[PDB]
Amino acid sequence: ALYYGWNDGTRQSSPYFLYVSPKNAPKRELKDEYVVYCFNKKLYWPDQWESIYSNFNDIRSPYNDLPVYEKKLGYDGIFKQYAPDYKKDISDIASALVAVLSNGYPTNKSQLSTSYHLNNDSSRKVTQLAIWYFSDSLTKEYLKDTGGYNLNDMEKKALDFLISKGEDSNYSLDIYVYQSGGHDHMKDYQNLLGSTLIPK
């Protein structure tokens, strides 16, 4: 199963908001099920799909060259394979990632909004940052203090929450393995992590 990966063009700086669309029948659908995250901090972000093009066939060349991904069912070994910079003192990266996404955006958006006082944008940003704690060994100081994400205190608290859920850890997550394409960079795009809990 092949997918396009794209950013929605709304973010002006990292992290960008990412979606996937089935390559078979691509639509610019912003539904929770299509929300994905950057699994590789150091690699390139998927190209934007501008909202001005509501239909894929309306995208003018060369910007319809979106990066193409293969969707795979995630498990610990393959999470570690495609994120070699993963947090090494975590034995089961899969359960940690599953914990983050179970408690993060969008699955847990209501509690994040109510109890941590975030809007969906903040919830999504904080979920991305927490994923990177595990996928890329990013330190709390880089995420909260020195990396330029400009977190407010509610975001910092929500991030701690997500990181604790991951550390303190059925369902799995999809992994989208970058295959080819992407006009912007034509290579070395991020692999993407699904945000939907997949029963198996």
Partner: protein, 155 residues
């Protein structure tokens, strides 16, 4: 300012663990004591990119111009997160010595580094920035020229 904490974190910049050095750089930036400037400049050359980012951030926070020449070098760091942190720090320090290196950084491969360099130039501002922008508008091309034309229309 707690001189005891400053000494403790300065010592921690030599810790074998990169995570400890990150915390140390970050702590020293928050304290703001200029006694940390020479150790943080050394830390700009750390093997670990998160230490270099945090050292750059801390030096931006302290705002001591002793950091300007080493941060200019960090503008061409192999790592884009370090380049961004250096550009942002140079903007915060506000020394005009940084204008021409920041102008070159407008042609960085990473769009967020470019955006950060553009914002740092805006934060420095003044006539050297203005002059550099007109030169760009006339002889430059690409994103740098876009930044310049926008700058001149807004100033």
């Amino acid at each position: 300012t707690d001189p005891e904490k400053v000494e403790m974190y300065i010592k921690n910049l030599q810790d074998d663990s990169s995570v400890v050095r990150v915390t140390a750089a970050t702590a020293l930036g928050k304290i703001g004591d200029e006694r940390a400037v020479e150790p943080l400049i050394k830390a700009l050359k750390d093997e670990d990119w998160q230490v270099r980012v945090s050292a750059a951030w801390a030096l931006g926070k302290i705002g001591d111009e002793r950091a300007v020449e080493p941060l200019i070098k960090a503008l061409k760091d192999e790592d884009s997160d370090v380049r961004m942190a250096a550009a942002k720090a140079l903007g915060k320090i506000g020394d005009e010595r940084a204008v021409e290196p920041l102008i070159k950084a407008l042609k960085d491969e990473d769009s967020d580094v470019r955006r950060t360099a553009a914002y740092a130039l805006g934060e420095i501002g003044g006539e050297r920035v203005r002059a550099a922008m007109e030169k760009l508008a006339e002889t430059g091309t690409g994103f740098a020229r876009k930044v310049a034309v926008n700058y001149l229309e807004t100033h």
